[PDB]
Symmetry: C3
Subunit: 114 residues, 3 copies
Amino acid sequence: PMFIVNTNVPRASVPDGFLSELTQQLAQATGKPPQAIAVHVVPDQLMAFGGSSEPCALCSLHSIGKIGGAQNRSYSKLLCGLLAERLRISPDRVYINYYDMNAANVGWNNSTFA
Amino acid sequence: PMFIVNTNVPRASVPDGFLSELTQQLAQATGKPPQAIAVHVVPDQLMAFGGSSEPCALCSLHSIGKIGGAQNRSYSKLLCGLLAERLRISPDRVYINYYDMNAANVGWNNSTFA
Amino acid sequence: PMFIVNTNVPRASVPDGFLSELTQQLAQATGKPPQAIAVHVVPDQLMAFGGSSEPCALCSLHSIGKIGGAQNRSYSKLLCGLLAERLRISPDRVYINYYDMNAANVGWNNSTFA
């Protein structure tokens, strides 16, 4: 799984340990081992959400499986909770796009996962 | 809806008001209220388009519905017109990927839109 | 086709010529002409892959066709080889998400490719 967060929050507000904590929490939530988890945080962005430039986040979670109605609700609670707690972004100012990737469309280590 | 623009145009060439104007124009084009619109501009990028590093843009519009053949043609005219007018990027150096997101695959406010 | 590379490798480690070489090699691999190829490199990112912050890359390749099981295996060998050779990123520290785009969902030049 791969989680990306783009936000207008400044780099100095991203706490040390945030990528590690995302890795561990996503491993637990997806059921996939941490060895397979990639995380990416992109601060200082120029963005607006609902006509305001107050703190917000545009995110995405891509996974080979483990994506669906109930799981996504559960991810959204978890990930909004983390972004609220660590980056002070209110949950109603976060979008998370979920992608269920086909194994044949994910490359890694000179091949794909098919 | 969420609109992202990645470009090699410098940050000082993005006019003040560009994010608000994108918000308003996208609200009108998609028929969705501005409260639901998110916009993200990423300048100063290292990129090339057709073997040239002249001004270009790689963009995406994600929306829960309101994506289809005719609408997308209409969005592309609108968006290329704005990028040409405001950032001085020629329309033939812009790509816009359109994604029709399932409500169950978009998180927000601790849950999804399903 | 559009190829994007997000990496924690520093900007000074991206060699001159890297975007041109990506353009050329992607043109040969996809069979599409270089006029249609767009490439984007984003260095200095805050990221982790498998619980480590050693050099890694999160990438994507979007193409109107030319995406499938065998082609993606081929692309992944090619692109991991380039990233290993030019940016010193090990292949097992790279993810590449492949997207087969519908022509009606790609805008360019005030219209779409449908």
